[PDB]
Symmetry: C3
Subunit: 115 residues, 3 copies
C-alpha cells in the first residue's frame, strides 16, 4: 500500500516515529504485510480543510484490491481515524481520507513492472 | 473539493493567507460550499515545468461531478489561472492544472464513508 | 509528463540540479519533448518504504498515451531506476514508481483545456 499524509501541523507537532506506527497500523488495517507498506508524511504545509485553516491532515491510501468498495473503505476509515485523531491531536472533523485502487501494471519495482 | 498546489517559490514568496483566498476562490469557481473545500500548499520545492526551473506551480483539483468534462474544466481553468498568476506573480506559462474526478466511495470522513 | 518525487533524504543529500537532470532523462525515456516535461522534488519528508524508514524515494509519473501498459512501464522503470538509484545513492529496493495515464481534458494550460 501507499499512504501519503499532508498536514499543516509543524514537524515538531507530529509525534516522532509517526511514519513507523502508521506503517504498522496500515499493515494490520489493510491486511497487507508490513514489508509491502509505504508511508510518506509531509508536515509544515499551509492547509484549509472544510473551509478552515485550523490544524488538519489529508491521508491518501493507494493499494491493489482492498480499497475499491465503500464497505472495505468504511472499515478502513474507522481504524485510520481512531489512529490519526489521537496521534495528531486532531478532531475527527479535521482529517479526510482518499482511497485510490491501483493495478500491478502501474507499479515500477526494482527496475521492472510485475504483473 | 481537494486542491493541492506545489511550488518552487519559497514560502516567503507565497503571499500570506493564499490557502484561505484559494479556498474561497475554489468554492465560487467550482460551485461548491466553502465548508467542503480543502486546499494544501507545498512551497519551497525543487521544480521544472515545461522544461524550465524558473518559478512555477502545479495545481491538482479533485471533486465529485464538476471536474469531469473538457467544457467544465476549461471554465474552471480560466478562473484558477486569473487567480494564481496574480497571487504568485507567475506568467500563465508557469502554471499547470490537473483535474481528477472522485466518487463518494473514495472519501473517508469522520471515520466512515458516505455513499 | 508530470513527475513527482518524494524522499526522506534531506535536501542537502539530493544532488543540486536533480530536477533538471530528471527532466532531461524523462524526456528521453518517455519519448516526449523536454519542453513538455514537469518535475517536482519534495525532500526532507518522513517516509517508510517496504516497511523500512531507511532512505528511500517515491516517483509518480503521469502522461498521455505512454504510461498505460505493463510493457511500456517496464521499459520506463529500468531507465528511471538506473538514473535515480545512482543520483540518490539508493539501492533499487528503496525506490518505487507509480504510473498514471492522463487524458488531455484533465490538463488546464494557459487558462483553458486543449482537447
Amino acid at each position: 500500500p501507499f499512504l501519503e499524509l499532508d498536514t499543516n501541523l509543524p514537524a515538531n507537532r507530529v509525534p516522532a516515529g509517526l511514519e513507523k506506527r502508521l506503517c504498522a497500523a496500515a499493515a494490520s488495517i489493510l491486511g497487507k504485510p508490513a514489508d509491502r507498506v509505504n508511508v510518506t508524511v509531509r508536515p509544515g504545509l499551509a492547509m484549509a480543510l472544510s473551509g478552515s485553516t485550523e490544524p488538519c491532515a489529508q491521508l491518501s491510501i493507494s493499494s491493489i484490491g482492498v480499497v475499491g468498495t465503500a464497505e472495505d473503505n468504511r472499515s478502513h476509515s474507522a481504524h485510520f481515524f481512531e489512529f490519526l485523531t489521537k496521534e495528531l491531536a486532531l478532531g475527527q472533523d479535521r482529517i479526510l481520507i482518499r482511497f485510490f485502487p491501483l493495478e500491478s501494471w502501474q507499479i515500477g519495482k526494482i527496475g521492472t513492472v510485475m504483473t
